[PDB]
Design an enzyme around this catalytic site. Sequence first.
Site, PDB file in Angstrom:
ATOM      1  N   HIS A   1     -26.991 -35.858  52.222  1.00 11.07           N
ATOM      2  CA  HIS A   1     -28.087 -36.662  51.742  1.00 11.07           C
ATOM      3  C   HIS A   1     -29.098 -35.878  50.812  1.00 11.07           C
ATOM      4  O   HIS A   1     -29.954 -36.552  49.984  1.00 11.07           O
ATOM      5  CB  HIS A   1     -28.905 -37.381  52.913  1.00 11.07           C
TER       6      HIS A   1
ATOM      7  N   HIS B   1     -37.081 -30.859  52.688  1.00 12.05           N
ATOM      8  CA  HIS B   1     -36.003 -31.350  51.901  1.00 12.05           C
ATOM      9  C   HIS B   1     -36.434 -32.184  50.601  1.00 12.05           C
ATOM     10  O   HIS B   1     -37.765 -32.182  50.408  1.00 12.05           O
ATOM     11  CB  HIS B   1     -35.070 -32.622  52.759  1.00 12.05           C
TER      12      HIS B   1
ATOM     13  N   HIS C   1     -35.932 -34.992  47.618  1.00 10.91           N
ATOM     14  CA  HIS C   1     -35.572 -36.414  46.683  1.00 10.91           C
ATOM     15  C   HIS C   1     -35.815 -36.136  45.354  1.00 10.91           C
ATOM     16  O   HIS C   1     -36.870 -35.707  44.734  1.00 10.91           O
ATOM     17  CB  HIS C   1     -36.498 -37.306  47.259  1.00 10.91           C
TER      18      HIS C   1
ATOM     19  N   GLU D   1     -40.126 -40.707  46.037  1.00 15.15           N
ATOM     20  CA  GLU D   1     -40.336 -41.872  46.766  1.00 15.15           C
ATOM     21  C   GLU D   1     -41.531 -42.556  46.877  1.00 15.15           C
ATOM     22  O   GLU D   1     -41.496 -44.085  46.573  1.00 15.15           O
ATOM     23  CB  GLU D   1     -39.802 -41.326  48.195  1.00 15.15           C
TER      24      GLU D   1
ATOM     25  N   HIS E   1     -40.447 -33.210  50.897  1.00 12.52           N
ATOM     26  CA  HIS E   1     -40.954 -33.657  51.977  1.00 12.52           C
ATOM     27  C   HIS E   1     -40.964 -32.576  53.175  1.00 12.52           C
ATOM     28  O   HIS E   1     -39.873 -31.992  53.556  1.00 12.52           O
ATOM     29  CB  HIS E   1     -40.009 -34.799  52.632  1.00 12.52           C
TER      30      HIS E   1
ATOM     31  N   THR F   1     -37.977 -42.320  55.569  1.00 13.62           N
ATOM     32  CA  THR F   1     -37.517 -42.899  54.593  1.00 13.62           C
ATOM     33  C   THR F   1     -35.977 -42.850  54.583  1.00 13.62           C
ATOM     34  O   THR F   1     -35.445 -43.555  53.759  1.00 13.62           O
ATOM     35  CB  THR F   1     -37.932 -42.098  53.497  1.00 13.62           C
ATOM     36  N   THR F   2     -35.462 -42.435  55.610  1.00 12.08           N
ATOM     37  CA  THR F   2     -34.129 -42.569  55.621  1.00 12.08           C
ATOM     38  C   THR F   2     -33.566 -43.142  57.279  1.00 12.08           C
ATOM     39  O   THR F   2     -34.564 -42.988  57.974  1.00 12.08           O
ATOM     40  CB  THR F   2     -33.330 -41.156  55.471  1.00 12.08           C
TER      41      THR F   2
HETATM   42 CO   LIG Z   1     -37.365 -37.506  52.731  1.00 15.91          CO
END
Ligand SMILES: [Co+2]
EC number: 4.2.1.1
Length: 258
Positions: free
Chosen positions: A62, A92, A94, A104, A117, A196-197
């Site tokens: 991811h 991590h 995005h 995001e 994040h 968010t996941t």
């Molecule tokens: Co995130």
Amino acid sequence: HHWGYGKHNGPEHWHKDFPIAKGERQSPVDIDTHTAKYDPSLKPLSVSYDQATSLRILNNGHAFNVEFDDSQDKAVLKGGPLDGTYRLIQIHMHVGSLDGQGSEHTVDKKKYAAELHLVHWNTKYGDFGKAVQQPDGLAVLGIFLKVGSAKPGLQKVVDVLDSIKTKGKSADFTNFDPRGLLPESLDYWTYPGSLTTPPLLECVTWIVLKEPISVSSEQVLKFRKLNFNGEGEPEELMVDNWRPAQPLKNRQIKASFK
Ligand SMILES: [Co+2]
């Protein structure tokens, strides 16, 4: 199959397995700077990553994730809208397929090339697992990425991406100082949100820095070379692994700056 960002398993399908995806405190959200409320009553943000201790970097399919030793108060977040101590556990990224998308959170509908994040959890809860079950268990630091001068702090990650190209791959990542991922200014916006996941738990106090950090074209290009897939399967570039903005509802977004 598993949850992801594709047509058949992307953010639009998440609510079926995690009904909370349609809750009242979902993340991310759009930040309307003309309506965000400046709150001069917020203690200044305190980032103490002096004794930070990273362990490894991993591709879970991811995103890439840098894990940290959170057994002690070595790299914590306090101040701002936070009460108590929050321990840094993972970082991590995005990213988008185009410079014009990837983040995001958005500001006045504008999307950044990417969003970092930095995940922290409330020490008043014992561990991460227990923390995600609390409305104030996590404190996530969001940093927008914008193309410009190369970021040295990110080059460390860039130089190892090759070794963790596919899902499940991991590499040693000790001696990584997260301080190098911050912009100069600590001005931020904050509001109560969720992961968010999946499981999309509404357990996080979001702190999104106003000032993005700059990354070179070469760096952003290398951040898009990772794979969603596992070695041996048809190659699916890990790009656009972001959840769109969710309904703010009656939540209020506050600014730390005038
Ligand atoms: Co995130």
